[PDB]
């Protein structure tokens, strides 16, 4: 068998045997074990620069940073090619793509057979959660992409320290990734190898993850969505914990009281910006700190509280829109040591994306850029054709420790107690700015039925409203109706301790006016909504009862520093009967599709809302 070049510190025979089997299938030219060091990261980056995948950015403008641009077919998640191959189709459910496991194995085996000819297999060891902690899980990703390897260094705890935890007998999550572009002897490679044919396949009974054809982070960083949401949610269902598509933030008010909240918004619908927001004018003495921006693992304790940890080590965030007004903590985070993907290149060797002009002299566009497709770009081109310099789903990858607002407990394996949950989709109509659920069951109803307009984070037509329960439509690892029951059962467990349950809120930053612009300013001004939630948590905030829950009056929010009138507030908080009647019919369609194992409590809650609308 091919020489594995196994390091001496790898003491795990079952792991080595699995690598041997995967090398025999994928047939790479050579095998490299990533140790996760800083020196190795620099060498792999230089390798990417030599291949043309990376351009090194100007050291004076953007220290130790790189720019990659991808094939236009490989810019986002591909939901139609993502599968949960559970033993029974009913354990995948209507929200997932299913295929009989033996039939998927026969589909993928010829694809992976020889997939890495002409390439190096990188062995990427990683821990999700702090290394060696009771809540952490170890994975091994085999990849033929050094781009995956360097991004995994930032997004996970990667490298040789993992094998100390694994030891001789520890188990691991097996992850296989190929760009699906084997190379003949003497064949010229492309700068972004990929395949038009893609599969991202999960086998829950074995915890196997197979990814073919994509180098895009959401499809190829297999610890992130594939393990820490899809596989982990199935483990949590069996073991009494949750894996959620949620940010976690800490907020401290001027009296020094600190609270933590977890918020589920769909991909590209505001989590990163909320998780590190800066309190605006009017909020002297408040502070917001970031635990995580994307994935949360949550379990109840005997004290009746819910404890959350962020299993990731970095941010893989949407770049367009980011500037010093919308997200200054992010702007400071990506000052250096960052990987940018599909943004534009300036004449001085820096990066640019739509939105950065708001910090520019005269708030003007740059005179010339090279766009993410390598084409010349100018403001005249932008004005005449609308060409985007940066792709709408362009990304930065940066270590969490670069964030000035990083919470001191961001990597504490004891977790933080969650005082409130927030759910919210991208909705141009119908949904008010903020609503508090009257009960846990009503809150689960709000999360189960939320809708959101599709975004550039996945392929397909953007701007289309769809149901996205708990912001987990692309990431739920088992039947969505059993997941609803899991949340209902968890609340009952918490209540039996005598505790007061965390409140559940719906939010909507994204109501549009007649010209299609946003009526609510959002970004830092979302602090004004968060401050109301804190008041409610403390039992000091007022609210008015309406059809879907409790909402603040104008006078219940702090408007110091923001010119936003009572009339503008009425627009984004009014409950419109006709719009909610239509919305409830869309809930009925979801419940029809999810009839199997649908908790009866959801139909009962829907019937009460219908009464309140006909009252």
Among 482, 477, 470, which residue's Cα sits nearest to residue 445? 470
Which of the listed partners (Mg ion, Mn ion, ligand GDP, none) does 125 bind, with a CB threshold of 5 to 8 Å by partner kind?
none
Q: Is 599 in the site for Mg ion (CB under 5 A)?
A: no
**Is 26 in contact with 151 (CB distance < 8 Å)?**
no
Which residue's CB is nearer to Mn ion, number 294 or number 453? 294
Which residue's CB is nearer to ligand GDP, number 321 or number 599? 321
CA distance 36 to 214: 23
CB of 245 to Mn ion, least distance (A): 6
Question: Which residue reads 């918490």 in tokens?
Answer: 494
Among 193, 181, 184, 137, which residue's Cα sits nearest to residue 162? 137
Q: What is the dihedral of CA 219, 223, 227, 229, to 10 degrees?
A: -80
Q: Is 454 annotated as a binding residue?
A: no
CA distance 191 to 65: 18
Using CB under 6 A as the binding criterion, the count of chain residues that bind ligand GDP stands at: 19
Which residue's CB is nearer to Mg ion, number 272 or number 435? 272
Main-chain dihedrals φ then ψ at residue 243, nearest 5 degrees: -120, 115
Q: Is 507 in the site for ligand GDP (CB under 6 A)?
A: no
Q: Is 509 in the site for ligand GDP (CB under 6 A)?
A: yes
Among 276, 229, 357, which residue's Cα sits nearest to residue 527? 276
Q: Is 294 in the site for Mn ion (CB under 5 A)?
A: yes
CB of 270 to Mg ion, least distance (A): 8
Which of the listed partners (Mg ion, ligand GDP, Mn ion, none) does 352 bind, with a CB threshold of 5 to 8 Å by partner kind?
none
Which residue's CB is nearer to ligand GDP, number 202 or number 395? 395
CA distance 159 to 124: 7
CB of 554 to Mg ion, least distance (A): 31
CB of 266 to ligand GDP, least distance (A): 7
Q: Is 77 annotated as a binding residue?
A: yes
Q: Is 93 annotated as a binding residue?
A: no
Report residue 476 as tokens: 């739920």
What does the per-residue mask of binding to Mg ion show for 181-220, with x meaning CB under 5 A?
----------------------------------------
Query: Which one is catalytic: 26, 34, 175, 269?
Result: 269
Q: Is 268 in the site for ligand GDP (CB under 6 A)?
A: yes
Q: Provide the β-strand partners of residue 300.
A: 306
- Residue number with the shortest CB distance to Mg ion? 272
Which residue's CB is nearer to Mg ion, number 33 or number 315? 315
Report residue 158 as tokens: 């990667």
Among 584, 589, 591, which residue's Cα sits nearest to residue 613? 584
Which residue's CB is nearer to Mg ion, number 232 or number 295? 295
Q: Is 269 a catalytic residue?
A: yes
H or E segment to which residue 121 belongs: strand 120-128
Q: Is 272 in the site for Mg ion (CB under 5 A)?
A: yes
Q: Is 317 in the site for Mg ion (CB under 5 A)?
A: yes
**Is 371 in contact with 344 (CB distance < 8 Å)?**
yes
Q: Of residues 510-569, which lie at the interface with ligand GDP (CB under 6 A)?
A: 518, 522-523, 526
Q: Which span (19-27, 31-39, 115-123, 264-272) binds Mg ion, by CB under 5 A?
A: 264-272
- Burial (CB count within 10 angstroms: exposed 0-12, middle 13-18, buried 19+), residue 585: exposed
Question: Which residue reads 């003007």 in tokens?
Answer: 364
CA distance 473 to 448: 10
Which positions are annotated as active-site residues?
269
Question: Could you list the residues that contact Mn ion (CB under 5 A)?
Answer: 267, 294
Question: Could you list the residues that contact ligand GDP (CB under 6 A)?
Answer: 265, 267-273, 293, 317-318, 320-321, 326, 509, 518, 522-523, 526
């Amino acid at each position: 068998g091919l020489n594995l070049n196994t390091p001496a510190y790898v003491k795990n025979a079952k792991l080595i045997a699995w690598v041997a089997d995967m090398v025999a299938l994928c047939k790479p030219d050579t095998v490299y074990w990533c140790d996760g060091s800083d020196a190795e990261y620099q060498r792999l980056c230089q390798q990417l620069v030599d291949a043309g995948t990376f351009k090194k950015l100007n050291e004076a403008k953007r220290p130790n940073s790189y720019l990659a641009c991808s094939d236009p077919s490989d810019v986002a998640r591909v939901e139609d090619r993502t599968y949960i191959c559970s033993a029974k189709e009913e354990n995948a459910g209507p929200t997932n793509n299913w295929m009989e496991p033996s039939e998927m194995r026969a589909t993928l085996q010829p694809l992976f057979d020889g997939c890495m000819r002409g390439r190096t297999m990188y062995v990427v060891p990683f821990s999700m959660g702090p290394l060696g902690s009771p809540i952490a899980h170890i994975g091994i990703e085999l990849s033929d992409s050094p781009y995956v390897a360097v991004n995994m260094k930032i997004m996970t705890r990667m490298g040789k320290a993992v094998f100390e935890v694994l030891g001789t007998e520890g188990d691991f999550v097996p992850c296989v990734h190929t760009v699906g572009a084997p190379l003949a002897e003497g064949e010229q490679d492309v700068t972004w190898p990929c395949n038009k044919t893609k599969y991202i396949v999960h086998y829950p009974e074995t915890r196997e993850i197979w990814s073919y054809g994509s180098g895009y982070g959401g499809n190829a960083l297999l610890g992130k969505k594939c393990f820490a949401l899809r596989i982990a949610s199935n483990m949590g269902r069996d073991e009494g914990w949750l894996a959620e598509h949620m940010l976690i933030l800490g907020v401290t008010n001027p009296e020094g009281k600190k609270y933590h909240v977890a918020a589920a918004f769909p991909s590209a619908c505001g989590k990163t910006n909320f998780s590190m927001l800066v309190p605006p004018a009017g909020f002297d003495g408040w502070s917001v700190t970031t635990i995580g921006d994307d994935i949360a693992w949550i379990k109840p304790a005997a004290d009746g509280k819910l404890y959350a940890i962020n299993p990731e080590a970095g941010y893989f965030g949407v770049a367009p829109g980011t500037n010093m007004l919308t997200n200054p903590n992010c702007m400071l985070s990506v000052r250096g040591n960052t990987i940018f993907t599909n943004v534009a290149l300036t004449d001085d060797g820096d990066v640019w994306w739509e939105g950065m002009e708001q910090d520019a002299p005269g708030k003007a566009l740059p005179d010339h850029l090279i766009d993410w497709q390598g084409k010349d770009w100018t403001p005249q081109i932008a004005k005449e054709t609308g060409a985007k310099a940066a792709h709408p789903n362009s990304r930065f990858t940066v270590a969490a420790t670069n964030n000035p607002a990083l919470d001191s407990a961001w990597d504490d394996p004891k977790g933080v107690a969650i005082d409130a949950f927030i759910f919210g989709g991208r909705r141009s109509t119908t949904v008010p700015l903020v609503t508090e659920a009257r009960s846990w069951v009503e809150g689960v109803y709000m999360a189960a039925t939320m809708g959101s307009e599709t975004t550039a984070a996945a392929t397909g037509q953007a701007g289309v409203v769809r149901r996205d329960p708990f912001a987990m439509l692309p990431f739920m690892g088992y039947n969505m109706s059993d997941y609803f029951q899991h949340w209902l059962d968890l609340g009952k467990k918490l209540a039996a301790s005598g505790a007061t349950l965390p409140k559940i809120y719906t939010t909507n930053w994204f109501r549009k006016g007649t010209d299609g612009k946003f009526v609510w300013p959002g970004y830092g001004e979302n602090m004004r909504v968060l401050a109301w939630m804190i008041d409610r948590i403390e039992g000091k905030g007022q609210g008015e009862d309406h059809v879907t829950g409790i909402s603040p009056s104008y006078e219940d929010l702090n408007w110091t520093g923001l010119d936003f009138s009572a009339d503008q507030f009425n627009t984004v908080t009014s409950i419109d009967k006709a719009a909610w009647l239509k919305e409830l019919e869309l809930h009925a369609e979801l419940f029809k599709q999810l009839e199997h194992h649908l908790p009866k409590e959801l139909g009962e809650t829907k019937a009460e809302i219908e009464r309140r609308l006909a009252a």
